[PDB]
Amino acid sequence: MVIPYDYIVIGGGSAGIASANRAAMHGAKVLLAEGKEIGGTCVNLGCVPKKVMWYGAQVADILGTYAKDYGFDFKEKAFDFKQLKANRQAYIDRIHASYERGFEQNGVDRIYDYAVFKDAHTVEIAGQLYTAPHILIATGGHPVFPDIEGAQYGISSDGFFALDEVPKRTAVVGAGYIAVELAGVLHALGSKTDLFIRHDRPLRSFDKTIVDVLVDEMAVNGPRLHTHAEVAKVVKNTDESLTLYLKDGQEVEVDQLIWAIGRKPNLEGFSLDKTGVTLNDKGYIETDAYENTSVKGIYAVGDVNGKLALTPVAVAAGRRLSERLFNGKTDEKLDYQNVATVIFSHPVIGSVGLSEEAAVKQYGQEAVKTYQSRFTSMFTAITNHRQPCLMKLVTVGDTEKIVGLHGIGYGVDEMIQGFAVAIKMGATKADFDNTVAIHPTGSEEFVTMR
Amino acid sequence: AMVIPYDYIVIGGGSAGIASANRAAMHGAKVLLAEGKEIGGTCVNLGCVPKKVMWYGAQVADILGTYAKDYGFDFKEKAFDFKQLKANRQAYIDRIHASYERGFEQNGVDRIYDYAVFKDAHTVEIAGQLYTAPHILIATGGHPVFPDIEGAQYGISSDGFFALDEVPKRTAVVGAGYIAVELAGVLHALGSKTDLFIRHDRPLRSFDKTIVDVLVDEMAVNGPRLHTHAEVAKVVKNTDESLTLYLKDGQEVEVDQLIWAIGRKPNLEGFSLDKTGVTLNDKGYIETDAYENTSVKGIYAVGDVNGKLALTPVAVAAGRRLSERLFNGKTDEKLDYQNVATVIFSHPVIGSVGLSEEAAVKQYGQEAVKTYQSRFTSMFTAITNHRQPCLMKLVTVGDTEKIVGLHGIGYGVDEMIQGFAVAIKMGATKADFDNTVAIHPTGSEEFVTMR
Ligand SMILES: Cc1cc2nc3c(=O)[nH]c(=O)nc-3n(C[C@H](O)[C@H](O)[C@H](O)COP(=O)(O)OP(=O)(O)OC[C@H]3O[C@@H](n4cnc5c(N)ncnc54)[C@H](O)[C@@H]3O)c2cc1C
Ligand SMILES: Cc1cc2nc3c(=O)[nH]c(=O)nc-3n(C[C@H](O)[C@H](O)[C@H](O)COP(=O)(O)OP(=O)(O)OC[C@H]3O[C@@H](n4cnc5c(N)ncnc54)[C@H](O)[C@@H]3O)c2cc1C
Ligand SMILES: Cc1cc2nc3c(=O)[nH]c(=O)nc-3n(C[C@H](O)[C@H](O)[C@H](O)CO)c2cc1C
Ligand SMILES: [Cl-]
Ligand SMILES: [Cl-]
Ligand SMILES: [Cl-]
Ligand SMILES: [Cl-]
Ligand SMILES: [Cl-]
Ligand SMILES: [Cl-]
Ligand SMILES: [Cl-]
Ligand SMILES: [Cl-]
């Protein structure tokens, strides 16, 4: 006895929930399987708790650094990490309850268990067979641990959310946005923080002028950056502390070691090999522009397809797929070009489009012209801890089309979304120049460069 | 005895005058700028800048007094040194003055820190010396006014707010524009028992009512006490030095300070404008065409004195475009005063660009207008016991759903609008918004995910 559905979604993360709900909105009978907690990485171990801890860091900077220069004094300051975590978990628990009510309203069927393939169009969940002509693999990814002696004494970003107290000393190893974000939060919350990168600078894919501001501010306040660093081994002393040994002979003793050296897709444990789905050279599920796998009736959306590991990409791709399969939108698909990103570093980095380096590689040096503005954020300008801001435009051709917009500085996290619309619409430097500024804001520096 | 010739004389060293003088100098003009008070005008010394610094102080007060507890932070014996905040604020303004002097040196602008008075249409007297030029810009700005009632002298203007050295225990703010709403929110956050008096039904009457209703509801739950349909009849100074406002309906409200924020008037008196022939429009401002020309050839008026739109970026762009027209031969250069974005530093902050739903329905008819909204709680306040609402609204027109208005209220909205203002200037549609991928997690993503 096999139970039929119009759509089976494997994974209740950003990709699965979005695609499941949109499919249900268009009359499809949908089954969603989730082996862990609803909301996947974004809600339980990613964007959401990361942002809550980042706001905790912004409050920590107000109390320990800026409040004094605004005339506010106090004493017996104390920090209760368990209270911030309990409030963080209560908020996530309300997001879980909200998704469930949504499923009760739209009629999505959910099974909180592991889905395993039997063949290309049939899955087994809790000893019951389910079949559908449309199956979405939305299994996400997982953190990677290096093949280094003692690597098991360290934790990943999952481990960061399991901490119950600020470590006195923390080592963060990695050079991507997660390494930089977690290092900044631990530093703001009072941990002696050391960040280790293997090459010359962090965030290698982001505009160098922007990252250089971040590196300089880290050297003034932030975590201690160690460049050209390779961990040789990690030893756990009998006193429970960890000793990191670098290939160059240096060593650092810490209380916690966070590995943020990459993520890999969840491809094993669910008989993916019984479907015939093929992987690309990168090791992700191979898909076309419409998220079709190599097998008809099987789609792959989110981190598991390796295109862009961002929640809004997974959400939009999943909704556009449901539109295509169940609302007759044959040509519906996501444009993965010019997707804006915000890194909750200290200060915050916002970016959309090409770095100067990427524009030069795609259009040639003569065609590229950049505009930039450096200034101190008014918020920090009245204090003894002045923080720089840098906003940059990357333009190409005689009409100076804006192919990239990047910023670093206080409040940049909320500035990018509107500009990402203008760039999607083909904005030129003349469109920016014809827009009247909003004063006083940091965002106005984007439209007043000459 | 001798008249000194210049190519361009600029009366006033505020947002309009500095912008027009520097741009004219970059184009080779011999420029003279007169400033009778401080360089930077209202914006730098008594407007945008000191107002924003005090707004940041209010945000810090809200962190210490309301939100820190829910983020796990505790402390005792909190104290607030208003004089230290004010000292740091004025030191920042002193550095801004020096930046303007540095720019005049680089561009080659001649400046005199004295009051300019017209002798005739093409001649001014400054410090006893006559200067003449075929191009003269009046960029004199405006000033706050006091109501013509008994005891009005006991109140202070926004200028008096910046002169305060301590937070008043009780403050009355009379006014319904952005200045009254911003100063009431700052006083309330800094600990003053604040009362806001408006003559009509709601404040910010020109803004979308859906947005302002969220502001009014937030004030009722936590902010200043709003008094509607209030007319101040007189103010009495009590023997204990407190003040009592008498309303026309007979109500009495006792306070320590009373701020008048009932409107500004243009600076038209004291500089012999009556010797130029320049005429005023029926609104009482210097009359101008779309090119900032006064009724007298060779005299121009930019900024608050022309009454078109009292914002710093407007004064700056119009002053720059005027100099492009007079000294760079750009014959048709002029500022477009429509679709100018504004941010009101209320609690929570309001951002707005284009038409309100009511204004769109009036110009295009309900049949052609469709609005979209997103209602949510800012994540920053959502983990606390003091959840703050956010509301974002899109006003669309016709079959292509052209975005004619974009408005928001909520934590962080002040920095979200500039980019959308570019999209709306370029003629964005709901389809352009839908095709832009969101940035998560941010409040700004709610503007592109409405259905
Ligand atoms: C620390 C961190 C911070 C981040 N910050 C941001 C940010 O600020 N902004 C942003 O846009 N992105 C951010 N991301 C990325 C974002 O979280 C991911 O891109 C997004 O969650 C991917 O969604 P998904 O649906 O592809 O996968 P996931 O959210 O991982 O969902 C996959 C789900 O499938 C389940 N599953 C797997 N196999 C099975 C099976 N056989 N049966 C049933 N269920 C199964 C898993 O248990 C999991 O719940 C961050 C990520 C991390 C780790
Ligand atoms: C409390 C407050 C808050 C504000 N907040 C904002 C905001 O957040 N954003 C925004 O965009 N706008 C804001 N504004 C408005 C902004 O300050 C004005 O629109 C702007 O200053 C107008 O510039 P202006 O050049 O027309 O006039 P002003 O900046 O007022 O400049 C006029 C100058 O001319 C001088 N002057 C006058 N007559 C003579 C003479 N005969 N000879 C020599 N000098 C003379 C004066 O001394 C003065 O310095 C605010 C205003 C106030 C009062
Ligand atoms: C008769 C008269 C003389 C003035 N003289 C000066 C002056 O010498 N310096 C100055 O900065 N402002 C002067 N002002 C303007 C005034 O001080 C200030 O700009 C207020 O904004 C106007 O109410 C004068 C105004 C008038 C009416
Ligand atoms: Cl959804
Ligand atoms: Cl990177
Ligand atoms: Cl670069
Ligand atoms: Cl990583
Ligand atoms: Cl400064
Ligand atoms: Cl300028
Ligand atoms: Cl006063
Ligand atoms: Cl006013």
Coordinates of N, CA, C and O and ligand atoms in Angstrom, one line a residue, chain B residues 15 17-23 26 100 103-104 107 316 320, ligand 9:
Chain B
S15 N 23.2 75.6 3.7 CA 23.2 74.4 2.7 C 23.1 75.0 1.3 O 23.9 74.4 0.5
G17 N 23.7 78.2 0.1 CA 24.8 79.1 -0.3 C 26.2 78.4 -0.5 O 26.8 78.7 -1.4
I18 N 26.5 77.5 0.5 CA 27.8 76.8 0.4 C 27.8 75.9 -0.9 O 28.8 76.0 -1.7
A19 N 26.7 75.2 -1.1 CA 26.7 74.3 -2.3 C 26.8 75.1 -3.6 O 27.6 74.7 -4.5
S20 N 26.1 76.3 -3.7 CA 26.1 77.1 -5.0 C 27.5 77.8 -5.1 O 28.0 77.8 -6.3
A21 N 28.0 78.3 -4.1 CA 29.3 79.0 -4.1 C 30.5 78.1 -4.6 O 31.2 78.4 -5.5
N22 N 30.6 76.9 -3.9 CA 31.6 75.9 -4.3 C 31.5 75.5 -5.7 O 32.5 75.4 -6.4
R23 N 30.2 75.1 -6.1 CA 30.1 74.7 -7.5 C 30.4 75.8 -8.5 O 31.1 75.5 -9.5
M26 N 34.2 76.0 -8.7 CA 34.8 74.9 -9.5 C 34.7 75.2 -11.0 O 35.5 74.7 -11.8
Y100 N 34.3 72.9 6.2 CA 33.8 73.9 5.2 C 34.9 74.9 4.8 O 35.0 75.2 3.6
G103 N 37.3 73.3 2.4 CA 36.7 73.3 1.1 C 36.8 74.6 0.3 O 37.0 74.6 -0.9
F104 N 36.5 75.7 1.1 CA 36.5 77.0 0.4 C 38.0 77.3 0.0 O 38.2 77.9 -1.1
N107 N 38.6 75.1 -3.3 CA 37.8 75.6 -4.5 C 38.1 77.1 -4.9 O 37.8 77.5 -6.0
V316 N 20.8 72.0 -1.4 CA 22.2 71.6 -2.0 C 22.0 71.4 -3.5 O 22.8 72.0 -4.3
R320 N 23.5 73.8 -6.5 CA 24.5 73.2 -7.5 C 24.0 73.3 -8.9 O 24.8 73.8 -9.8
Ligands
CL9 CL 29.7 71.8 -1.4

